[PDB]
Swiss-Prot record, chain C:
It comes from Homo sapiens (Human). Binds DNA as a homotetramer. Isoform composition of the tetramer may determine transactivation activity. Isoforms Alpha and Gamma interact with HIPK2. Interacts with SSRP1, leading to stimulate coactivator activity. Isoform 1 and isoform 2 interact with WWP1. Interacts with PDS5A. Isoform 5 (via activation domain) interacts with NOC2L. Residues 1-47 are annotated as: Oligomerization. It is found in: Nucleus. Residues 41-54 have a biased composition (Low complexity). Belongs to the p53 family. May be sumoylated. Ubiquitinated. Polyubiquitination involves WWP1 and leads to proteasomal degradation of this protein. Widely expressed, notably in heart, kidney, placenta, prostate, skeletal muscle, testis and thymus, although the precise isoform varies according to tissue type. Progenitor cell layers of skin, breast, eye and prostate express high levels of DeltaN-type isoforms. Isoform 10 is predominantly expressed in skin squamous cell carcinomas, but not in normal skin tissues. Acts as a sequence specific DNA binding transcriptional activator or repressor. The isoforms contain a varying set of transactivation and auto-regulating transactivation inhibiting domains thus showing an isoform specific activity. Isoform 2 activates RIPK4 transcription. May be required in conjunction with TP73/p73 for initiation of p53/TP53 dependent apoptosis in response to genotoxic insults and the presence of activated oncogenes. Involved in Notch signaling by probably inducing JAG1 and JAG2. Plays a role in the regulation of epithelial morphogenesis. It is linked to Acro-dermato-ungual-lacrimal-tooth syndrome: A form of ectodermal dysplasia. Ectodermal dysplasia defines a heterogeneous group of disorders due to abnormal development of two or more ectodermal structures. ADULT syndrome involves ectrodactyly, syndactyly, finger- and toenail dysplasia, hypoplastic breasts and nipples, intensive freckling, lacrimal duct atresia, frontal alopecia, primary hypodontia and loss of permanent teeth. ADULT syndrome differs significantly from EEC3 syndrome by the absence of facial clefting. Inheritance is autosomal dominant. Ankyloblepharon-ectodermal defects-cleft lip/palate: An autosomal dominant condition characterized by congenital ectodermal dysplasia with coarse, wiry, sparse hair, dystrophic nails, slight hypohidrosis, scalp infections, ankyloblepharon filiform adnatum, maxillary hypoplasia, hypodontia and cleft lip/palate. The transactivation inhibitory domain (TID) can interact with, and inhibit the activity of the N-terminal transcriptional activation domain of TA*-type isoforms. This is Tumor protein 63.
Amino acid sequence: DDELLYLPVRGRETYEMLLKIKESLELMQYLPQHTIETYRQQQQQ
Amino acid sequence: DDELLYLPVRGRETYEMLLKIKESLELMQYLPQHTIETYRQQQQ
Amino acid sequence: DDELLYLPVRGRETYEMLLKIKESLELMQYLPQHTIETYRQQQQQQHQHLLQKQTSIQ
Amino acid sequence: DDELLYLPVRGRETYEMLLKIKESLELMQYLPQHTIETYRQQQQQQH
């Protein structure tokens, strides 16, 4: 949830890819619950 | 520029992992770029 | 189940990123399960058993 | 090329997800490149 964990990565290219996915997953907590629904009602539209 | 594309997936479990990643990547566009920079600066 | 499903994606950049992740996840099925288990055991050991210590269920 | 880097992750769920992706990317080296081409050709056959 808030646990600080370290992921060992081999190479800059893999690191940059995992960093972009890590960021998107962590940034979801900075989104309002209304945005997360607005988008989800737009997905089935 | 955001077109609608369909990704064929083999397996339920792979589909679920990909769905969670797709949502988080697409939802980033609904964040102000200032919030993304505020977060990135806080990470370093 | 290993069924054919279609994931709708908005944007080329997200699609290409998902395409690369899908390929590596699907390509793992082309490896013997014994290779995957061995690789995972070798990963557990390294970095003062970091991946072992960071395992949630024990 | 394959420099050891540590990615700090906040949250168990994000960590487990990234760990599974990292593993799949690293395990691809254990595949013969003929298998990767066979798979890619088979993917554009059902497209």
